[PDB]
């Protein structure tokens, strides 16, 4: 899951970041390696929000080359894929805790950015919710 | 930055970027309050709150 | 990844488990749902002779129709993945850790299966060894 | 009689690794696991598969 960040340079000195796919996703930086750095940043928070909306994250458009993107780690790419499977089954929350057997206060988490994401947790959640969460290559 | 976070949108939750909604618009932006935010930054920031 | 499991039935009764990919992991039930049971247990136990001999993990055969099997967490197939990259790359522990920017006893952690796993560990320790981990929603 | 089982593969030289999960075999660079499970009976082609997974044919 890589999301290309688009940088328009501003004559003030310095550069502008955007991400086509997230449009909450806005911050700039001062230069090329400092603006990426704020990208991932920027990228990250901008997640938040859908979790907390409840709504689809659109996933990144296909990468072109040269583009410059930001590659998201497995611990959030892991619970961002995790949140439009539950959001499309149209399950509760508590139904996906009988099903997955643990009281709602850990399957809230699963639905937050902001703890640590113990991988094998999202897979059982995926299952319940129909998906199935694979890894590939290495 | 003083005008910025201000008057209409809501400066609610967050750590490293803040998450700023407005009556059902959602944008982020940096914090740092002594770097110059840019004029492309508030417009595409006010766009994305003022439009549906 | 999933490795299709081989129930034989016992003439006194009960099953026997074998699996055509580890020839370690040998184990019994007494009934299906005991010898599935056994068979993860004694799949998952086998793969330390692996980390511990320093030895490619045979990766699962594909599943044929009314195969039972065993789906291994994504806690575990991470890692191995990881042993099979870092073993052909043949550079050493020590390298690994100098190109990851950790100390050596963070990364000889990762090649074993008796702890948490940190998936963005894993990630940056497959991305040292040049290769890439990827999620996949069914 | 996993018990005398296991009590076997010790008199022949196997040695059984500690652990929670599986015993964990090992016999002249063979390896195998076997359950631990000492009260239940192994099962007799669970029995030959590990002897001769471990090379005790």
Same mark, same amino acid.
């Given at each position: 899951?890589?999301?290309? =960040?688009?940088?328009?340079?501003?004559?003030?000195?310095?550069?502008? =970041? %955007?991400?086509?796919?997230?449009? *909450?996703? $806005?911050?700039?930086?001062?230069? =090329?390696?400092?603006?990426? *750095?704020?990208?991932?940043?920027?990228?990250?928070?901008?997640? &938040?929000?859908?979790? *907390?909306?409840? *709504?689809?994250?659109?996933?990144?458009?296909?990468?072109?080359?040269?583009?410059?993107?930001?590659?998201?780690? $497995?611990?959030?790419?892991?619970?961002?894929?995790? $949140?439009?499977?539950?959001?499309?089954?149209?399950?509760?929350?508590?139904?996906?805790? #009988?099903?997955?057997?643990? +009281?709602?206060?850990?399957?809230?988490?699963?639905?937050?950015?902001?703890?640590?994401?113990?991988?094998?947790?999202?897979?059982?959640?995926?299952?319940?919710?129909?998906?199935?969460?694979?890894?590939?290559?290495? | 930055? #003083?005008?910025?976070? %201000?008057?209409?949108? &809501? =400066?609610?939750?967050?750590?490293?970027?803040? !998450?700023?909604?407005?009556?059902?618009?959602?944008?982020?932006? +940096?914090?740092?309050?002594?770097?110059?935010?840019?004029?492309?930054?508030?417009?595409?920031?006010? !766009?994305?709150?003022?439009? %549906?």
């Amino acid at each position: 899951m890589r999301y290309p =960040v688009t940088l328009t340079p501003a004559p003030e000195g310095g550069y502008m =970041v %955007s991400f086509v796919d997230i449009p *909450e996703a $806005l911050t700039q930086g001062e230069t =090329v390696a400092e603006a990426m *750095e704020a990208a991932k940043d920027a990228l990250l928070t901008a997640f &938040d929000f859908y979790f *907390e909306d409840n *709504e689809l994250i659109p996933l990144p458009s296909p990468l072109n080359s040269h583009d410059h993107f930001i590659e998201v780690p $497995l611990s959030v790419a892991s619970k961002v894929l995790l $949140l439009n499977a539950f959001l499309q089954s149209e399950i509760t929350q508590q139904e996906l805790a #009988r099903r997955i057997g643990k +009281p709602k206060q850990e399957i809230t988490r699963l639905f937050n950015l902001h703890h640590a994401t113990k991988i094998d947790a999202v897979q059982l959640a995926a299952k319940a919710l129909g998906k199935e969460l694979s890894l590939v290559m290495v | 930055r #003083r005008w910025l976070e %201000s008057q209409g949108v &809501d =400066v609610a939750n967050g750590s490293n970027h803040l !998450k700023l909604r407005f009556h059902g618009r959602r944008s982020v932006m +940096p914090r740092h309050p002594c770097d110059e935010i840019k004029e492309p930054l508030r417009k595409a920031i006010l !766009k994305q709150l003022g439009l %549906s």
